[PDB]
Design a binder for this molecule. Sequence first.
Ligand SMILES: Nc1ncnc2c1ncn2[C@@H]1O[C@H](COP(=O)(O)OP(=O)(O)OP(=O)(O)O)[C@@H](O)[C@H]1O
Ligand SMILES: Nc1ncnc2c1ncn2[C@@H]1O[C@H](COP(=O)(O)OP(=O)(O)OP(=O)(O)O)[C@@H](O)[C@H]1O
Ligand SMILES: Nc1ncnc2c1ncn2[C@@H]1O[C@H](COP(=O)(O)OP(=O)(O)O)[C@@H](O)[C@H]1O
Ligand SMILES: [Mg+2]
Ligand SMILES: [Mg+2]
Ligand SMILES: [Mg+2]
Lengths: 219, 384, 394
Amino acid sequence: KGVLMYGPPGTGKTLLARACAAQTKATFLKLAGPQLVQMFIGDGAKLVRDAFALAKEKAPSIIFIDELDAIGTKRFDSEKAGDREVQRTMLELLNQLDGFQPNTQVKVIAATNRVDILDPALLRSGRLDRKIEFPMPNEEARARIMQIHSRKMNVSPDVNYEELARCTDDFNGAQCKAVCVEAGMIALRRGATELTHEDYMEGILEVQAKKKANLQYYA
Amino acid sequence: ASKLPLVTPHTQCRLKLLKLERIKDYLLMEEEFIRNQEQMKPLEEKQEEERSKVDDLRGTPMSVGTLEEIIDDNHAIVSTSVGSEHYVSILSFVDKDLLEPGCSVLLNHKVHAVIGVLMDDTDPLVTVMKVEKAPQETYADIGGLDNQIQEIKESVELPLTHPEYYEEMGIKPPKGVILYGPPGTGKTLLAKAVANQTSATFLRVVGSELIQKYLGDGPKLVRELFRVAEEHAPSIVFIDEIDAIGTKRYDSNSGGEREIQRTMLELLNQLDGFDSRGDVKVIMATNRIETLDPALIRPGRIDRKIEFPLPDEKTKKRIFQIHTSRMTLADDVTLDDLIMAKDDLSGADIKAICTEAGLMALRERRMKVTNEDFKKSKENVLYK
Amino acid sequence: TYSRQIKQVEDDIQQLLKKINELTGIKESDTGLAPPALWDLAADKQTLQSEQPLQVARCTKIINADSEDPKYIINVKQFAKFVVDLSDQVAPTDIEEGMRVGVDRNKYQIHIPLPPKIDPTVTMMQVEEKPDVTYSDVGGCKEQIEKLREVVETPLLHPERFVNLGIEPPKGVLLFGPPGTGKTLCARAVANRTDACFIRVIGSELVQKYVGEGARMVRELFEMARTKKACLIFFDEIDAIGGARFDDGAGGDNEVQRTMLELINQLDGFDPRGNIKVLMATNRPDTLDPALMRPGRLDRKIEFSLPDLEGRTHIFKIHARSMSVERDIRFELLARLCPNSTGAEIRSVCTEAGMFAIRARRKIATEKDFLEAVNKVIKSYAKFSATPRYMTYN
Ligand SMILES: Nc1ncnc2c1ncn2[C@@H]1O[C@H](COP(=O)(O)OP(=O)(O)OP(=O)(O)O)[C@@H](O)[C@H]1O
Ligand SMILES: Nc1ncnc2c1ncn2[C@@H]1O[C@H](COP(=O)(O)OP(=O)(O)OP(=O)(O)O)[C@@H](O)[C@H]1O
Ligand SMILES: Nc1ncnc2c1ncn2[C@@H]1O[C@H](COP(=O)(O)OP(=O)(O)O)[C@@H](O)[C@H]1O
Ligand SMILES: [Mg+2]
Ligand SMILES: [Mg+2]
Ligand SMILES: [Mg+2]
């Protein structure tokens, strides 16, 4: 009961949620991070118990949370100042999630990128069970992502995805997605229809976004 | 009422004769097209009858409502004073225009239909931040500087009074004016003579009173401030002591320096926004010119940078002559001994010594001020 | 000869203007009335026709319907909640749930649906109006104009070159450099050229007093943005709306970060903005959060540096074309004297250099007047200069 995904924010975290949302034929229910943040008091908390009442009603149903750190900030003892109202809704998220009167009808899918902000009370063992990270692609998945996003484009067979994924290190699925669209734009700049190797190679330099400053005086 | 803007001529010209006799054509011909109305169909008076027909449409319980939207086919959603809004219709004596979202209107008592609009009693803040009258004397009160007076007249007064010199040049005036130096050097005192000189609407704000206690009320006060500055006409906005937003921290502000920062972002917008700015000149003054953000001091946001040095001794004697003009000066005194008393005395020091010396004369009920009044006056003012 | 005779024939007919315009009726300076000739539509017919048959039809908000029956659940501003019904004039199709409807005061039944709330502070930041800045006025950064303009308007003005090739164009771009470099002025050419909704946003306008108040303004922003076909959303000074998350010990600067995360969620994931293009412009990019800096939100990454020599000379030709000059001056000598200078500084050199001609008694400035501008603007204001801790963006 309760899975958590965390890692760099470009490794693909919304993508699995929209994947399984297409897979299972259940009552999919999504949430925004600061959606449980209200001006008046108690409204976000009632918004928690109403949503989990509805997911209680739909017995096949799973709940998603995107960007939990908007509400899941670790508490702090402070006089003279300090918010409390977010920690109200966070505490009913704790108790209403797990504790008094539990159930096994819903499954929780939580998505964040940063962990150290989080209150460990939701990080206990049973509120959020399976904490998985999404690392950066090694080389082969970098070839695979651009192979996926290179589908609907006119690709001449001058490509070498193993060469491309090796000359492109330190990228994610978003940047490897961006190489495909910028390489797809350079060919329209030169009026070409198919895609060649140098369109990708020039797309690399735009995705990397280097500062141009007059350097040919090496070597 | 805006009948004919041709008021050029300025002598005994026949054009003036024939044009005023052709206004006599539109008025004699058509005063004979004013006679016939109540002669043919009286049927009412139309001066009050149709007017009291409107006034018998609209009831005496005129509820005051508030606009929030407009649908063009004379019905809209208007706000009640309670908060429970309606979907009433709009009349034909409502002159469909002075209607903006947020405007105070006049509704029916029965069906709450949009009867009339209401003139707005504005807000007191405009009268608070708006200088009404001329403060004091002219630039001849200042004395000794004589260089940057041409600079402030250059950037402010001359664009206003002579809109020919920039057009024969094909050029626009510089935008921002900043004033900096030691304290008490007459930085505000120059703006006094500017507020004497100009005919434009003048606003003045201290840089200390920008800061607030609530969140965003600072930048909101900036936005409505430049709103008030633009919504008049040619205007001059003066900012005094803008280092104080960055120097002193107060515990009334809930946000820390990263709320002051965001206020500086909003003001940094309001100097050089992409919007059409208008005829709003900006004059600023401080003494800690080195502390604040150089992003606000760049050309484009502030164009003219004006330093005020300390007064040299030959200008000092002029300032003594200024502040000792209308007083009964006994011949006991020598002002040259009073010049080198402090090596870096400000212009405020001179006036303080003069006024306190007059206080020493009024302790002894005399009419003239003697030398020992100055001798113990510099001890009282300077040395403590 | 007819000295008084032209004056009194002037004044009696200018007065007789008033002596009959008071007999017309424009007078009785009101408290919010129409001119008395303007209103005569509602004179006899609509006085008893737009008032006496006409209702009030107080508007409400629908909670939900139910199956098999109309049996609607209504909601109002403060009062209670009713089970209500349609009229015969409308179908039950567009009486969908969560919708404002006009409702009579006695039977309490639905007449006509209403458009939703826009929260008119979000309405005011639609530009409604265009500036006059031409791309010719942004000379010196032509390749940045091209690399921006290929993203901003080319799918909007031509949605066939990208679709028929089979690519989806990027939607996001940030513009960044030193101040005074032509970023805001560069966006003014975009608001000049384009045609769709240009909704401007300055990052210091979303700082609110309550908790989570600004994040709902992001929501209403993108809700009215998704109603339109295509839209361009402008972002200015986004360091105010977020640098990063750094919270340690006591919670400081939390409130802005929730609005920033809301802006992230409204940008990517879960059936995205579709045809909504965004355009940021900041001063220092190093403060910015990497999840905001992820492509798919901020694809194009345009730097605005200083011109090398020739862009500067072109800027001299921009700001110096419309001023009375000596003919045989050269601008390249002036550009050799400004190694590191922005276009606003060049404009200040020009606008001061004309003031030198206004100093004594000259209608057209000279080359030595320009030299009097260079040492004052460049080398005498050189204490401030505003640039060097912004070249490193710190
Ligand atoms: N050059 C001067 N000649 C005559 N009087 C002066 C001069 N400079 C200052 N004074 C007098 O001293 C007083 C204070 O001057 P002013 O308010 O301009 O100082 P300031 O530099 O503006 O201080 P701050 O800007 O820190 O408030 C004025 O009332 C003015 O009469
Ligand atoms: N390349 C250029 N050519 C001509 N004028 C320029 C150029 N770059 C900047 N300017 C001048 O700079 C002024 C302001 O530019 P802008 O407001 O875009 O600065 P910015 O780069 O947005 O920095 P900031 O965000 O601090 O304003 C304009 O009035 C314009 O005349
Ligand atoms: N197999 C993949 N690996 C990595 N990235 C991918 C993959 N497939 C698609 N992507 C891209 O990465 C993004 C995944 O979103 P995600 O990283 O969850 O956003 P964030 O975590 O910043 O909210 C998508 O926008 C998509 O374009
Ligand atoms: Mg996500
Ligand atoms: Mg002063
Ligand atoms: Mg700018």
